[PDB]
Write an enzyme that holds these catalytic residues in place. Structure first.
Site, PDB file in Angstrom:
ATOM      1  N   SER A 112       0.818  -1.202   0.000  1.00  8.74           N
ATOM      2  CA  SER A 112       0.000   0.000   0.000  1.00  8.74           C
ATOM      3  C   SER A 112       0.864   1.271   0.000  1.00  8.74           C
ATOM      4  O   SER A 112       1.614   1.519  -0.952  1.00  8.74           O
ATOM      5  CB  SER A 112      -0.914  -0.035   1.223  1.00  8.74           C
ATOM      6  OG  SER A 112      -1.906   0.925   1.129  1.00  8.74           O
TER       7      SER A 112
ATOM      8  N   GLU B 150      -9.307  -3.929  -4.233  1.00  5.76           N
ATOM      9  CA  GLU B 150      -8.542  -2.926  -3.503  1.00  5.76           C
ATOM     10  C   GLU B 150      -9.367  -1.775  -2.936  1.00  5.76           C
ATOM     11  O   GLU B 150      -9.044  -1.248  -1.870  1.00  5.76           O
ATOM     12  CB  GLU B 150      -7.464  -2.318  -4.419  1.00  5.76           C
ATOM     13  CG  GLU B 150      -6.446  -3.303  -4.987  1.00  5.76           C
ATOM     14  CD  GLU B 150      -5.298  -3.605  -4.035  1.00  5.76           C
ATOM     15  OE1 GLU B 150      -4.252  -4.087  -4.511  1.00  5.76           O
ATOM     16  OE2 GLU B 150      -5.434  -3.368  -2.819  1.00  5.76           O
TER      17      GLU B 150
ATOM     18  N   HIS C 150      -8.160  -4.837   0.415  1.00  4.87           N
ATOM     19  CA  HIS C 150      -6.910  -4.124   0.557  1.00  4.87           C
ATOM     20  C   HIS C 150      -6.200  -4.519   1.844  1.00  4.87           C
ATOM     21  O   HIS C 150      -6.788  -4.477   2.924  1.00  4.87           O
ATOM     22  CB  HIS C 150      -7.212  -2.626   0.549  1.00  4.87           C
ATOM     23  CG  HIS C 150      -5.996  -1.758   0.495  1.00  4.87           C
ATOM     24  ND1 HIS C 150      -5.078  -1.825  -0.531  1.00  4.87           N
ATOM     25  CD2 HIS C 150      -5.564  -0.780   1.325  1.00  4.87           C
ATOM     26  CE1 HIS C 150      -4.132  -0.925  -0.332  1.00  4.87           C
ATOM     27  NE2 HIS C 150      -4.404  -0.277   0.787  1.00  4.87           N
TER      28      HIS C 150
END
Ligand SMILES: *[C@H]1O[C@H](CO)[C@@H](O[C@@H]2O[C@H](CO)[C@@H](O)[C@H](O)[C@H]2NC(C)=O)[C@H](O)[C@H]1NC(C)=O
Ligand code: NAG
Ligand code: CA
Ligand code: CA
Length: 534
Positions: free
Chosen positions: A209, A341, A449
């Site tokens: 991320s 995501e 995510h």
């Protein structure tokens, strides 16, 4: 028992955890406190001789994820938690937080020259710490594979502390302090890793991320020159969910908007020199002022208050432009994504239920987008609930008529399709890409995510075959295929190439597929990337 003699003669002691040896909390920079706030980190000068490093140091100051100038329950709730003595006990934070950690296989000695995996944590550039990313799973796995590696993690400043922007910051040359902390960490590794058994010429940088976007930033840093003392700081990178950051220059519009808001919040709105005034307020004041600016879970979602922004000095220009222009380091890379995501970010705007409100939300989020461009986006990403994320779940997960749509858009611009754009322009080195569908069927969130963090540091699963084994093989041989997986990982050359070019992961295991989904969104989104920057 574990000991190591740094480059300055100092001899330090670590902690023998049996399954591995650890050296936690080593300071690599002077406390970026007082007048050093927001400024480039300074190399540590003190001596460490005779000191023990057996526990993680405090994390840098954290920003309330639900922080915002508004006042609501989520914000009040998190604030109540994050300020509890219990919370500050289990997870301490401080402005004096620039420490680094080195964990290696048991019995590893100086000169071993093992490959090094330098982890950069992600947390929306607003929260995060190294202590919540256990390296044991990776290390043990690397040993059982006959490819022992050394795990290195570095703390860096986040939120207003590490990513403050605006005219003042730019004029000072203090932009992207958080990335600079990481960079110093890498140089520290180059000069001292040999003492722990690592080979400084075999450093692979990986992050997830925000940490993944950091990796990209390092590839583009100084127009691609990743050398230090004549040698590269890293020979490869692994990007787990995150490519280029779609952001305006440091002295752009939102960069300044946020800086002014923060200054007012801190009571510096009447200072002729707001920057010096901010360096004068106490930690608490700054912390409180920061929590009154939008966090990543607030309505603003992906339009982050703090994040890497081109400064014209270390990140010379628009990040998508730097890639097209080939201004990057030439290294082999692995970059992938989780199927869904954006579902996490889509929960921040559950007040949006109609197309008109959806269009409005997008106009507010991307101020550079023309109505035509917005119309195109809403055509590429239709209301049809069967078409959004969680992908392939038909009429399920319809929290609102817009949730799956907003989730799909945010997920693609910020990560999934951003990755394709990079892969379609990068000729720096060999490219490998994966797409996880490991959690297909998980209600509301899907293969969400950061789920890879679990299968990489906490639990074993089909995905661990990639997040551990494949990654260890890559850092060791620069080819994930030496891991000995049953499914061969094909090289990625173009989203337009024939034949499978994506390593896929489901609950049962691995298989390959093609990176040719949502082409309409790709065009609607990247015909002119700047139209969607923040
Ligand atoms: C849904 O909720 C959001 C979050 O509060 C609303 O946005 C805020 O609206 C207030 C009132 O106008 C403003 O003062 C804030 O500045 C807004 N927040 C931000 C960061 O923009 C939003 O208007 C609501 N949307 C709908 C369709 O009801
Ligand atoms: C920032 O960019 C300038 C421009 O050359 C350079 O002198 C400086 O070393 C860079 N800082 C870092 C951390 O690389
Ligand atoms: Ca201003
Ligand atoms: Ca070039």
């Amino acid at each position: 028992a574990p000991t190591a003699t740094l480059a300055n003669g100092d001899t330090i002691t670590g902690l023998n955890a049996i399954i591995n040896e650890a050296f936690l909390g080593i300071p690599f920079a002077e406390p970026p406190v007082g007048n050093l706030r927001f400024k480039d980190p300074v190399p540590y000068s003190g001596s460490l001789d005779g000191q023990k490093f057996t526990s993680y140091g405090p994390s840098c100051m954290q920003q309330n994820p639900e922080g915002t100038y508004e006042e609501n329950l989520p914000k009040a709730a998190l604030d109540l938690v994050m300020q509890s003595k219990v919370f500050e006990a289990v997870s301490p934070s401080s402005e004096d937080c620039l420490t680094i950690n080195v964990v290696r296989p048991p019995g590893t000695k100086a000169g071993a020259n093992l490959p090094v995996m330098l982890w950069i944590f992600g947390g929306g550039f607003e929260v995060g710490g190294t202590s919540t990313f256990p390296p044991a799973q990776m290390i043990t796995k690397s040993i059982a594979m006959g490819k022992p590696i050394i795990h290195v993690s570095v703390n860096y400043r986040v939120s207003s502390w590490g990513f403050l922007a605006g005219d003042e910051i730019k004029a000072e040359g203090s932009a992207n302090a958080g990335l600079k902390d990481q960079r110093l960490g890498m140089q520290w590794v180059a000069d001292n890793i040999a003492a722990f058994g690592g080979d400084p010429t075999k450093v692979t940088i990986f992050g997830e991320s925000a940490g993944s976007m950091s990796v990209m930033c390092h590839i583009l840093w100084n127009d691609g020159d990743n050398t230090y003392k004549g040698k590269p700081l890293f020979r490869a990178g692994i990007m787990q969910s995150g490519a280029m950051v779609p952001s305006d220059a440091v002295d752009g519009i939102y960069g300044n908007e946020i800086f002014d808001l923060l200054a007012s919040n801190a009571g510096c709105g009447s200072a002729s020199d707001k920057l010096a005034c901010l360096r004068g307020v106490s930690s608490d004041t700054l912390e409180d002022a920061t929590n009154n600016t939008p966090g990543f879970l607030a309505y603003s979602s992906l339009r982050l208050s703090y994040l890497p922004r081109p400064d014209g000095v270390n990140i010379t220009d628009d990040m998508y432009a730097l890639v097209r222009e080939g201004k990057y380091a030439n290294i082999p890379v692995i970059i992938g994504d989780q199927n869904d995501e954006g579902t996490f970010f889509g929960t921040s705007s559950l007040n949006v239920t109609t197309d008109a409100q959806a269009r409005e939300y997008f106009k507010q989020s991307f101020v550079h987008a023309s109505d035509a461009e917005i119309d195109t986006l809403m055509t590429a990403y239709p209301g049809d609930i069967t078409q959004g994320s969680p992908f392939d779940t038909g009429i399920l997960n319809a929290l609102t008529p817009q949730f799956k749509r907003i989730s799909a858009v945010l997920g693609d611009l910020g990560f999934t399709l951003a990755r394709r754009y990079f892969l379609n322009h990068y000729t720096g080195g060999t490219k490998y890409s994966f797409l996880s569908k490991q959690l297909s069927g998980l209600p509301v969130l899907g293969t969400f995510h950061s789920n890879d963090i679990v299968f990489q540091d906490y639990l074993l699963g089909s995905g661990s075959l990639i997040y551990n084994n494949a990654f260890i093989a890559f850092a060791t041989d620069l080819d994930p295929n030496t891991a000995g997986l049953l499914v061969k990982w094909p090289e990625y050359t173009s989203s337009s190439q024939s034949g499978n070019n994506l390593m896929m992961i489901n609950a049962l295991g691995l298989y390959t597929g093609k990176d040719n989904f949502r082409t309409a969104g790709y065009d609607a989104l990247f015909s002119n990337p700047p139209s969607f920057f923040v």
